[PDB]
Amino acid sequence: VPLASRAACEALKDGDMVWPNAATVVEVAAWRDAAPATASAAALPEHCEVSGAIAKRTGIDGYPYEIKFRLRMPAEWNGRFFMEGGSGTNGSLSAATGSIGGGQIASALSRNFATIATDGGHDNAVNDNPDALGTVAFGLDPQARLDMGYNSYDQVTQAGKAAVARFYGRAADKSYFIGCSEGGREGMMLSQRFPSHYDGIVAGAPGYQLPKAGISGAWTTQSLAPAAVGLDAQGVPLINKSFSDADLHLLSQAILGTCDALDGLADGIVDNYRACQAAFDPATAANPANGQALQCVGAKTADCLSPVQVTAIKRAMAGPVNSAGTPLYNRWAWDAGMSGLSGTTYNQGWRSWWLGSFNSSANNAQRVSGFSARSWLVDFATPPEPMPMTQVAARMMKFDFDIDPLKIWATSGQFTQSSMDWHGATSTDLAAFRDRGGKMILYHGMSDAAFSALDTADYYERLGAAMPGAAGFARLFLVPGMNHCSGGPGTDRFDMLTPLVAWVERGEAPDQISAWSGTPGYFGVAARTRPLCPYPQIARYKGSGDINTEANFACAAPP
Ligand SMILES: [Ca+2]
Ligand SMILES: [Zn+2]
Ligand SMILES: [Zn+2]
């Protein structure tokens, strides 16, 4: 009966603990000794670990579903509560020490937060249907779609805080959430749907319009097929064969030729992304290594993109339209992080989404036959479209941009909400959140090929338009060169939790956020640090000093 102790912990399993959801089943309530740090993780302090699940049930597809959660409460506690976000189609339960993304080694638990994670309402080892594209099969049960969209995050947040109050004898002082990609989508949902849940939110590469991802996939697949060479084993063009890595490298080298010095400093980084988009056209741009146009004047050479190739990538990058020309997603920024050479290793973190690996007799691009393609067909098209795995690439090739995009707005049968309803987080009404003191940091890599950074930018533009002074509670950090959540030739690592707490608890807004490069080899250097700047600002070299050193740069308007 002493608070914050072994006996208080073990007493949480079963009924002296009163859970807010009566269908909470604790499977584990265990005292854990402090654990040492490892090469990939910081030390963990002594704590009560609780895991279990909420709302065990049987879905209409005959499969079991439940909301799993795991929670960690340190014996020596700073008064703060933390939840980490998801990834992909979720379905797995992590260590739940409180990941802060950004390629960070530290966990929130290592900083004496109480921390929690969920699997989002389904389980990849159980919910795996061979007739419904394996692990996207949760899409066959309506309620599992709801838990994946919002309800699992909500159930798990309430369960955590109630255990925190019981264990420590007081409510948490402040609460925080960080997530990227599908995790970024959840933090944006929380600020909109559950504004008192978290005081501080970080949301990277946010899939805030995730049901549109597969529409862009069918589009980029069909856009690249004329440049393909040869067929796969089902008869479908080898989309991966449309550009060798050498070809994509010619592109990004041409983008650097047009765009790199527009920020004032030729450094392999397009800091002035707006000016870059205004200036770069592959059908006219020069290959800076030779005098000549990037696009072949006649026959194809190695220093030379064919007119078929140039036409294809321009169309992929423009974004999908229907027959009326209505934009269905957004366009994509040209940026050097479409390629990248570190040593002899070409950068795949852009390629892998629309093209897949050149060196293969099959298609393996995310948007052609991989997970995003399958996820669309079973999780976001309503009704679901299960099919054998070998028909997926053909189905993106036949995808009809007048018919099939409607299916992310439809309800049908017992699927009573559309995929945009339960998964979309497009709302700019953040007033409840700001007016209890909430603070939000958005980030996003410029050469992300899952979600367009420019579409996060348009979202932030709509937010500040609807809430004047938005920069007093919400700020957006674009990262030139970064791929999806990590990687690529840019400064893709950063501590997002320290500036967030300062903002929430002390009122210090972030005028910049320090960042560094996970792969400085992309520039041939041992390290690069750069200020991330609050949109619309960009990093600006002070005129003197090592270009790889943050302190020589300041956040400023574009020139
Ligand atoms: Ca530059
Ligand atoms: Zn455990
Ligand atoms: Zn040559």
Numbering used by the authors: 43 to 56, 59 to 603
Give me lines lifted from the publication on this model:
The overall domain architecture of the 65 kDa MHETase resembles that of feruloyl esterases, with a lid domain inserted between β-strand 7 and α-helix 15 of the α/β-hydrolase fold. As previously observed for feruloyl esterases, the presence of a structural calcium-binding site was confirmed by X-ray fluorescence spectroscopy for MHETase. Likewise, one of five disulfide bonds is flanking a catalytic triad (formed by S225, H528, D492) and the oxyanion hole comprising the backbone amide nitrogen atoms of G132 and E226. In the ligand-free structure of MHETase, several water molecules are maintained by a hydrogen bond network at the substrate-binding site. Despite their overall high similarity, a detailed comparison of MHETase structures in the absence and presence of the substrate reveals an induced-fit mechanism upon MHETA binding. In the ligand-free structure, F415 points away from the active site and thus opens it for substrate binding. While the α/β-hydrolase domain superimposes well with the closest structurally characterized feruloyl esterase homolog FaeB from A. oryzae (1.60 Å RMSD for 280 out of 342 residues aligned, 32.5% amino acid identity), the lid domain of MHETase contains several additional loops that markedly differ from FaeB (2.33 Å RMSD for 148 out of 215 residues aligned, 18.9% identity). The overall structures of MHETase and FaeB are structurally similar (2.04 Å RMSD for 421 out of 559 residues aligned) despite a relatively low number of amino acid identities (27.5%). When comparing MHETase with known tannase structures, e.g tannin acyl α/β-hydrolase from Lactobacillus plantarum (LptE), it is evident that only the overall fold of the α/β-hydrolase domain is similar (2.77 Å RMSD for 195 out of 282 residues aligned, 13.8% identity), while very large differences (5.24 Å RMSD) are observed for the lid domain. Contrasting consensus α/β-hydrolases, the bipartite architecture of MHETase parts catalysis from substrate recognition—a scenario where we envision the lid domain as a tunable platform to enhance catalytic properties (e.g. alleviating substrate release) or alter substrate specificity (as shown initially for the S416A, R411Q or F424N mutants reported here).
Recently, the bacterial strain Ideonella sakaiensis 201-F6 was discovered and shown to grow on low-crystallinity PET films. Two α/β-hydrolase fold enzymes (α/β-hydrolases), PETase and MHETase, work together to degrade PET in two steps via MHET, yielding TPA and ethylene glycol—the building blocks required for a new round of PET synthesis. We have determined crystal structures of recombinantly expressed and purified I. sakaiensis MHETase in its ligand-free form (2.05 Å resolution), MHETase bound to a nonhydrolyzable mono-(2-hydroxyethyl) terephthalamide (MHETA, 2.1 Å resolution) or to benzoic acid (BA, 2.2 Å resolution) as well as ligand-free PETase (2.0 Å resolution) (2a−f). PETase and MHETase only share the α/β-hydrolase fold (2.87 Å RMSD for 184 out of 262 residues aligned).
